[PDB]
């Protein structure tokens, strides 16, 4: 008996589920000997990392295996997250967290004689991220996963930094010399991608030939939901020389982020991504258990675009259909801009991308001809409505017909999609009202904003267990599915036992964190001390040389007076600059410099320390904030959009400093303003001080204690062996400062003094934080994406915990 | 055939 | 309770020694899940063969895993055998074999509704070979994790020969798309090569700086034993580039064996092999179990150099002793000398390796330095023994010193080895007695013959199982290591009952292997007919154009007289030629149009086949072999050292057609010539021809059939279309035909006459093939390996199954 | 420390 029901045997019937301690042991030692092809006397801690997370992702895959399974049965709508970075950190933890493993793991590796602490330290973080975008995108997948929907994760597949005489130095981050235990290879699924060549127009639809070819290598990675037994890919794609001198400029399609041909080589990565996705897509679709198959395409596939970086899937998804699938050029059309939605995260009018046309049409011809192509028709109906308005036209236009005439990525992206949207509310009112005025007076439904937010998973749950711990007595643990859960926590805005509990969960983190700045950068560190963070990428824009100013300042307090009650004060500056970036460089220096001064100075003693914080990643993202008091927002107004950082810091019990712009805006909505920390020029503020006009010169010599450090620096103070050496940043601060860091070196210096204050009445900070807790659950990355679901997706979140017995 |  | 004994629980206690069918499931369904993240209906069936690899693998691992730990514990001396190429074959079945699974796999794989023989057809030949060198390595390796030794393989880690209008057409082996699941990366063991620079004199040792680094990353394969739980290893290293345009100079070194800078490359290939190999072992032996620490190095290390090709291990481990080490150079010397021994499978005198200084010199400078120290002290000895003979010294000395001076890699080999050997007692001979007169002369013992062997395992329990199962029941399987138990087969040559199974075992692979041809090349074929194979690379000196000539004439008594008793005869000739060996690709299209002809025209029927074996290697030679009835060993006297295939013919049931020079001489001494098919010139018999002088004319005319189809060749006949084509052979056949191809056409002819005579006659064929059958014992390549552990490397065999439960 |  029993036929082709044989092939049925091939099921994960009884390797799945059974998530004890002896199995855990027994897959670990199957992993470090059959996989690792090591032993006990010969593996290095290494050897375990691997054997453990191995462990780890047979589970994750279990689940991943039961997933896809469902998804192929329900044929869902699905959505396609395009981004070109994905900054996802560590995975080890957080897939035990979201799976329900982390305690028997615990034990099972307690068992083998291991230290998981060891092993969970092993891990580098996954070089995909390079700023905010590549880590909005990491907590839409775990949002995604987690609220059950039928997501992707699309990007390219790819940076130490290090200090060194006070100076930051590159170095290369070889984040897969061991490999990558995580993420696996599809070769059977490569692709090819082309690029140069030319179109030859028959009666039989346009071809593209003469193509130079790079192939494209899916690398896929599960997404865990937390707890539903839900688990999502993440597809990476890396470039492969097909079979002369060229069979590297594939590879460099892909080998670093963020890099003439650097311009150049940067469309050939944008285009690599998105015709290997499309291509995906496509192929995925036609494959659904599902006249035209693609008259549903818009019902069943929903792509997002974070930022211009994808904007050719427009032409590219229209090349597809009109020169492959062969349909007609309005059909395709319409089913076009139904799958594309973008999402605008630039403020700026001065930094969207724009690709010269010569350049587009060497690599690119069969795409420019389609651009042009959209954009006549998409002139062609503005003519229509507005016939005299010329100055309407040449606006709106896509492309920028001057001195070498050039494509609007960004223009591309709106007429090509069904919705536009920013991230947070003022953010999103520019883009509407402003930034693109003539399409949202055209088809003003199309406008719309979503607010970022943060994953309370990695978050919270992950980093700060101790502050879950706290809260789950309290409130119960629904606030992990659902944030604005916290609110209840004001119900203890007086338990005076509470708030001990609470900045004693402060104490721990902030004392285990002390441990580490000594173990790492040696100094003593004051785990008393208000540990103040500043943790955004090095730039002028982002002030951090206003810390600085406001570090040195504080050092004075201390030396015009060495007895006067000040409140001790760790300050931490953490960050990169681009390798490029001349000023930064020097801001990163004169970090440098001063910290070296007032650590070493035994005058100042436990009262306040400086720390750069090197090579800030997400792991130590998750490292310091928990641990931090006073996070430091404190950006000129209107230069930020949103503000995930930001969120983070106010979620996990540290509490605000700056200014009304970005997402500080919807923190004081939610908390109250009295619960933060703000100051310095309002928009407004500074909407008139530029008309005046800006010269340091006033603040310089009328602010005391400004002259003091302003001239301590450049009276090379801190920079005894080169004085004049930092003379390069009082040019660029009196001349050119486009920041007007001494315009707020007011509000600052002397609002920091109402922390100090604060701080000093323990009561009246934990209430204050505990407002701020309780507030948090807005900017929950939850909460943002079922509104992308509802308003752009048009998909719909589960809570159905996907059966792994069926 | 189912494509994942 | 319980300590550190918890890192004792690190162990394979409870996952190894349990190969039942369950289990055997559950595992393939743990790796197509797990391992492959796969599941039933999206596996392909590459992904089965994976799944039931990846199976497989972790019982080779649990006891390599063992195996490597006798090692340590047991501290034996070490066997490194050192060859560019591995021809290794096919995997699975083979460890299947050794481990005694293939009938719970065989079961476990009919219950998940799977075709095992499809799964094992997926896997592709391992291009690690290109000809006997790498496929004696192969079953060395082998024999060596049988007969119990603490061996190892090293050699490089990098070709489909296609047919087309009758011509060969190269293709690419890309053996590694899907990857190889038997091999293990440990990148955690590379090591730095270096190439050009120069070297500085310090009076703290010399020192080699501005040096080019290139990294070798080692790849491990598990080697098994048959049956007694020993597994060896093979670690094949690849280039890698370290961090402008050089970063593939790297990678060249790795792409492609036997390759100006073709020469150089060859050069840096060779060096890279050596170097990261050499350093390799100096790290294991200072990390054995075990004044100073290399005293020992001889009695724990032995390296066999296969070939001149790796013949800079002399100075390289010369330069790390002296330079790295730094022991005197007298020391060194006296540790080298006893570690390596030489192998020289070179008949020739015009083919040894011979570097030209000026690049030895631009490329490895500490080098050359050596190499000039090893060659004056090696004179330096000679002109005191003989004071006078100025010219035993220029001949004896390393050095070629003229044009270009050279240095005679195989004059480094033998000063630098304490044994030098040869494949076969005459080859062995001309070694010693001619080729290396005045080398044997001095130190006369240093010389001596190993004579080549066949491993039992691969070539018959495997390829033919049937003739293993038959000999089995009539001689036990103690056959298995120890082939010359076959001699107690002769007790059957009165059996005509045992004559009769033999013969059918022969029909059967014999019926089989037809299948293959039919499905293959398409062609009717005759079951019935003999099947005569030549399977050899196709070359000048290699004749198959005799068989060729052997072929048409066959065909002409089919046609000046088409009913006269013919013995229906199915032949066979595969093999590849080098891309840019003009003539052989002439032959290769020669014997293609021929056999059109010879195919089509319906009045030969089923009476005479002809058949290119495309794309020839070792799996491929697993299927014709064991259903062979003639082997055709036809190469001109004088040109053949050994003959590994010459020996799997005859150990399954094939019979012999060739002359008296490399395997077929032992052959006859072991059977008796009277059982074998010996013809044309001895080597004495063409020692005379050539003073005598040879042109075809002579032959052409007295012998009329030659005529026939020596004129039917050139007159257009198999060549319609361009009977002018092969009018390139005729002029390197009368005119340069440096084998003498005609001067046998006699002998041959009619020696094959007799064959179709015997072949009339079963029963004197079978009484006659179990004549060979069991004379093929002496031809193991255990036997070979025993004799090298005696009398080379000092090391003896084991019959201990290593415990897997310990 | 064992080198295999
Ligand atoms: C490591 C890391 N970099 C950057 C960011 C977020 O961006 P920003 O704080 O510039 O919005 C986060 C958040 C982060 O964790
Ligand atoms: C595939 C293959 N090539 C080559 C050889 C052996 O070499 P030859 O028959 O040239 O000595 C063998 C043996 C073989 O199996």
């Given at each position: 008996?029993?036929?082709?029901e044989?092939?049925?045997?091939?099921?994960?019937?009884?390797?799945?589920?059974?998530?004890?301690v002896?199995?855990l042991?027994?897959?670990?030692?199957r992993?470090?000997?059959?996989?690792?092809?090591?032993?006990?006397?010969?593996?290095?801690?290494?050897?375990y990392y691997?054997?453990?997370?191995?462990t780890?992702?047979?589970?994750?895959?279990g689940?991943?295996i039961?997933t896809?399974?469902?998804?192929?049965?329900?044929?869902?709508?699905?959505?396609?997250?395009?981004?070109?970075?994905?900054?996802?950190?560590?995975?080890?933890?957080n897939?035990?967290?979201?799976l329900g493993?982390?305690?028997?793991?615990?034990?099972?590796?307690?068992?083998?004689?291991?230290?998981?602490?060891?092993?969970?330290?092993?891990?580098?973080?996954?070089?995909?991220?390079?700023?905010?975008?590549g880590?909005?995108?990491?907590?839409?997948?775990?949002?995604?996963?987690?609220?059950?929907?039928?997501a992707?994760?699309?990007?390219?597949?790819?940076?130490?930094?290090?200090?060194?005489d006070g100076?930051?130095?590159?170095?290369?981050?070889?984040?897969?010399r061991?490999?990558?235990?995580?993420?696996?290879?599809?070769?059977?699924?490569?692709?090819?991608?082309?690029?140069?060549?030319?179109?030859?127009?028959?009666?039989?639809?346009?071809?593209?030939?003469?193509?130079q070819?790079?192939?494209?290598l899916?690398?896929?990675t599960?997404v865990?939901?937390?707890?539903?037994?839900?688990?999502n890919?993440?597809?990476?794609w890396?470039?492969?020389?097909?079979?002369?001198?060229?069979?590297?400029?594939?590879?460099?399609?892909?080998?670093?982020?963020?890099?003439?041909?650097g311009?150049?080589?940067?469309?050939?990565?944008?285009?690599?991504?998105?015709?290997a996705?499309?291509?995906?897509?496509?192929?995925?679709?036609?494959?659904?258990?599902?006249?035209?198959?693609?008259?549903?395409?818009?019902?069943?596939?929903?792509?997002?675009?974070?930022?211009?970086?994808?904007?050719?899937?427009?032409?590219?998804?229209?090349?597809?259909?009109?020169?492959?699938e062969?349909?007609?050029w309005s059909?395709?059309?319409?089913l076009?801009?139904?799958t594309?939605?973008y999402?605008?995260?630039?403020?700026?009018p001065?930094?969207?991308?724009?690709?010269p046309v010569?350049?587009?049409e060497?690599?690119?011809?069969?795409?420019?001809?389609?651009?042009?192509?959209?954009?006549?028709?998409?002139?062609?109906?503005?003519?229509?409505?507005?016939?005299?308005?010329?100055?309407?036209?040449?606006?709106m236009?896509?492309?920028?017909?001057?001195?070498?005439?050039?494509?609007?990525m960004a223009?591309?992206?709106?007429?090509?999609?069904h919705?536009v949207?920013g991230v947070?509310?003022?953010?999103?009112?520019?883009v509407?009202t402003?930034?693109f005025?003539d399409?949202?007076?055209?088809?003003?439904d199309?406008?719309?904003?979503?607010?970022?937010?943060?994953?309370?998973?990695?978050?919270?749950?992950l980093?700060?267990?101790?502050?879950?711990?706290?809260?789950?007595?309290?409130?119960?643990?629904?606030?992990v599915?659902?944030?604005?859960?916290?609110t209840?926590?004001?119900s203890?805005?007086?338990?005076?036992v509470?708030?001990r509990?609470?900045?004693?969960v402060?104490?721990?983190?902030?004392?285990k964190?002390?441990?580490?700045?000594?173990?790492?950068?040696?100094?003593?560190?004051n785990?008393?001390?208000?540990?103040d963070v500043?943790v955004?990428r090095?730039?002028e824009?982002?002030?951090?040389?206003?810390?600085?100013?406001?570090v040195?300042?504080?050092?004075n307090?201390?030396?015009?007076?060495?007895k006067?009650?000040?409140?001790?004060?760790t300050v931490?500056?953490?960050?990169?600059?681009?390798?490029?970036?001349?000023?930064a460089?020097?801001?990163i220096?004169?970090?440098?410099?001063?910290?070296?001064?007032?650590?070493?100075?035994?005058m100042?003693?436990?009262?306040?320390?400086?720390?750069?914080?090197?090579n800030?990643?997400?792991?130590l993202?998750?490292?310091?904030?928990?641990?931090?008091?006073?996070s430091?927002?404190?950006?000129?107004?209107?230069?930020?959009?949103?503000?995930?950082?930001?969120?983070?810091?106010m979620?996990?019990?540290?509490?605000?400093?700056?200014?009304?712009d970005?997402?500080?805006?919807?923190?004081?909505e939610?908390?109250?303003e009295?619960?933060?920390?703000?100051?310095?020029?309002?928009?407004?503020?500074?909407?008139?001080?530029?008309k005046?006009?800006?010269?340091?010169?006033?603040?310089?010599?009328?602010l005391?204690?400004?002259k003091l450090?302003?001239?301590?620096?450049?009276?090379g103070?801190?920079?005894?062996?080169?004085?004049?050496?930092?003379?390069?940043?009082?040019?660029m601060?009196?001349?050119?400062?486009?920041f007007?860091?001494?315009?707020?070196?007011?509000?600052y210096?002397?609002?920091?003094?109402?922390?100090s204050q604060?701080?000093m009445?323990?009561?009246?900070?934990?209430?204050?934080?505990?407002?701020?807790?309780?507030?948090?659950?807005k900017?929950?990355?939850?909460?943002?994406?079922?509104?992308?679901?509802?308003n752009?997706?048009?998909?719909?979140?589960?809570?159905?915990?996907?059966?792994?017995?069926? | 055939?189912?494509?994942?």
């Amino acid at each position: 008996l029993t036929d082709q029901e044989k092939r049925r045997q091939i099921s994960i019937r009884g390797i799945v589920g059974v998530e004890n301690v002896a199995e855990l042991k027994k897959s670990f030692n199957r992993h470090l000997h059959f996989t690792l092809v090591k032993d006990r006397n010969v593996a290095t801690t290494r050897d375990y990392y691997f054997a453990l997370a191995h462990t780890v992702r047979d589970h994750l895959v279990g689940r991943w295996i039961r997933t896809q399974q469902h998804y192929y049965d329900k044929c869902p709508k699905r959505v396609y997250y395009l981004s070109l970075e994905f900054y996802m950190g560590r995975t080890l933890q957080n897939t035990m967290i979201n799976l329900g493993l982390q305690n028997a793991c615990d034990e099972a590796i307690y068992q083998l004689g291991l230290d998981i602490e060891e092993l969970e330290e092993i891990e580098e973080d996954a070089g995909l991220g390079n700023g905010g975008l590549g880590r909005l995108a990491a907590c839409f997948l775990d949002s995604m996963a987690t609220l059950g929907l039928a997501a992707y994760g699309y990007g390219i597949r790819y940076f130490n930094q290090k200090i060194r005489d006070g100076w930051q130095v590159e170095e290369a981050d070889d984040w897969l010399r061991y490999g990558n235990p995580w993420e696996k290879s599809r070769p059977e699924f490569m692709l090819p991608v082309h690029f140069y060549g030319k179109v030859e127009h028959t009666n039989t639809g346009t071809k593209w030939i003469d193509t130079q070819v790079v192939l494209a290598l899916p690398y896929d990675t599960p997404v865990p939901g937390y707890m539903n037994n839900t688990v999502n890919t993440m597809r990476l794609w890396s470039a492969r020389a097909p079979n002369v001198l060229d069979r590297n400029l594939a590879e460099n399609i892909s080998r670093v982020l963020y890099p003439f041909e650097g311009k150049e080589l940067r469309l050939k990565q944008e285009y690599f991504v998105v015709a290997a996705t499309l291509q995906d897509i496509i192929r995925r679709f036609k494959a659904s258990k599902f006249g035209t198959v693609f008259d549903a395409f818009p019902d069943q596939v929903a792509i997002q675009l974070n930022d211009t970086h994808p904007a050719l899937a427009i032409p590219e998804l229209m090349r597809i259909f009109v020169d492959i699938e062969k349909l007609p050029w309005s059909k395709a059309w319409e089913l076009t801009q139904k799958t594309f939605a973008y999402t605008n995260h630039t403020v700026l009018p001065e930094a969207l991308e724009r690709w010269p046309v010569d350049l587009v049409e060497k690599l690119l011809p069969r795409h420019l001809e389609i651009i042009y192509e959209i954009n006549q028709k998409h002139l062609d109906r503005i003519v229509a409505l507005f016939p005299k308005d010329v100055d309407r036209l040449r606006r709106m236009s896509l492309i920028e017909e001057e001195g070498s005439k050039r494509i609007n990525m960004a223009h591309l992206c709106i007429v090509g999609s069904h919705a536009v949207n920013g991230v947070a509310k003022i953010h999103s009112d520019i883009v509407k009202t402003k930034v693109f005025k003539d399409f949202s007076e055209l088809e003003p439904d199309k406008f719309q904003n979503k607010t970022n937010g943060i994953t309370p998973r990695r978050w919270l749950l992950l980093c700060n267990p101790g502050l879950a711990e706290l809260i789950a007595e309290k409130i119960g643990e629904d606030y992990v599915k659902d944030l604005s859960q916290l609110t209840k926590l004001h119900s203890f805005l007086g338990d005076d036992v509470f708030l001990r509990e609470l900045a004693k969960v402060k104490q721990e983190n902030k004392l285990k964190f002390s441990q580490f700045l000594e173990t790492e950068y040696k100094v003593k560190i004051n785990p008393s001390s208000m540990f103040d963070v500043q943790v955004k990428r090095i730039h002028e824009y982002k002030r951090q040389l206003l810390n600085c100013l406001h570090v040195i300042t504080m050092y004075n307090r201390i030396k015009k007076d060495p007895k006067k009650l000040f409140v001790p004060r760790t300050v931490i500056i953490g960050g990169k600059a681009a390798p490029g970036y001349h000023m930064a460089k020097m801001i990163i220096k004169l970090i440098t410099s001063v910290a070296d001064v007032v650590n070493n100075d035994p005058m100042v003693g436990s009262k306040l320390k400086v720390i750069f914080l090197e090579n800030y990643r997400v792991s130590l993202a998750e490292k310091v904030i928990p641990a931090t008091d006073l996070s430091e927002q404190i950006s000129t107004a209107g230069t930020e959009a949103s503000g995930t950082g930001n969120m983070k810091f106010m979620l996990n019990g540290a509490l605000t400093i700056g200014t009304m712009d970005g997402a500080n805006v919807e923190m004081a909505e939610e908390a109250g303003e009295e619960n933060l920390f703000i100051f310095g020029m309002r928009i407004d503020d500074v909407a008139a001080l530029d008309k005046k006009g800006y010269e340091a010169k006033e603040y310089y010599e009328a602010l005391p204690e400004l002259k003091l450090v302003i001239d301590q620096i450049d009276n090379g103070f801190f920079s005894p062996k080169q004085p004049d050496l930092f003379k390069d940043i009082i040019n660029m601060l009196f001349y050119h400062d486009r920041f007007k860091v001494f315009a707020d070196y007011e509000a600052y210096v002397k609002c920091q003094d109402k922390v100090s204050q604060l701080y000093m009445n323990p009561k009246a900070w934990n209430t204050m934080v505990l407002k701020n807790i309780a507030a948090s659950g807005k900017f929950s990355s939850d909460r943002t994406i079922k509104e992308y679901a509802q308003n752009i997706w048009n998909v719909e979140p589960s809570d159905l915990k996907i059966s792994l017995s069926n | 055939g189912p494509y994942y």
